[PDB]
Amino acid sequence: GAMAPSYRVKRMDIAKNDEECVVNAANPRGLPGDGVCKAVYKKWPESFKNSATPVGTAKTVMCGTYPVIHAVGPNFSNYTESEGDRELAAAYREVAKEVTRLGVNSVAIPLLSTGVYSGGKDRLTQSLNHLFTAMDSTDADVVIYCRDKEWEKKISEAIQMRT
Ligand SMILES: [Cl-]
Ligand SMILES: [Cl-]
Ligand SMILES: [Cl-]
Structure with missing residues (x-):
C-alpha cells in the first residue's frame, strides 16, 4: 500500500502517467476505439489481447509487466439513467x-x-x-x-472538500 493513500488530479494524457498501472475506459469488444481507449491502444497495444469484457466489468491484461485494467462503463445512449448508473458503479x-x-x-x-x-x-x-x-x-x-x-478545477475541489 501507499504510506498515506491520496487522491490527485492531473490534466494530461493518461498514456504518459507516472503510476504503477493504468485503467482504460474500454469498450466491451476490446476494440481500439476513440479518446482514452485509442491513446491506451497506441501506448500498450499488447494489452488488447483477449481484453473484451461485458459492461460493468474490468479485465486486466499485462503489457510486459505493466498492468492495463480494461474497465467497461455503460454507454448512456443505450442504457436508462437508472441501469446506466448501476453499471457505472459496478x-x-x-x-x-x-x-x-x-x-x-x-x-x-x-x-x-x-x-x-x-x-x-x-x-x-x-x-x-x-x-x-x-x-x-x-x-x-x-x-x-x-x-x-x-474539469481539473472541479475534480481538485471535490478531492480537497474531504481533506
Ligand atoms: Cl499531455
Ligand atoms: Cl467515455
Ligand atoms: Cl475532461
Whole structure:
C-alpha cells in the first residue's frame, strides 16, 4: 500500500502517467476505439489481447509487466439513467478489486462514461462519486486524469472538500 493513500488530479494524457498501472475506459469488444481507449491502444497495444469484457466489468491484461485494467462503463445512449448508473458503479467496484489483487501502490484512472459514453450529459460528479465509493477502501495512490481545464478545477475541489 501507499504510506498515506491520496487522491490527485492531473490534466494530461493518461498514456504518459507516472503510476504503477493504468485503467482504460474500454469498450466491451476490446476494440481500439476513440479518446482514452485509442491513446491506451497506441501506448500498450499488447494489452488488447483477449481484453473484451461485458459492461460493468474490468479485465486486466499485462503489457510486459505493466498492468492495463480494461474497465467497461455503460454507454448512456443505450442504457436508462437508472441501469446506466448501476453499471457505472459496478465497473468502478471491479476496478477496486483488480487494483487490490495486483498489489500496486498507485493507479492512473480516467472518469468512466464522461466522454462519448456520456449520452451528451455532464457526468463529472456522478462518475467521480462512484470512483470514490469504490476506491476509498483501497490503499493505492489514485491519480485521476482529465483533459478539460474546468474539469481539473472541479475534480481538485471535490478531492480537497474531504481533506
Ligand atoms: Cl499531455
Ligand atoms: Cl467515455
Ligand atoms: Cl475532461
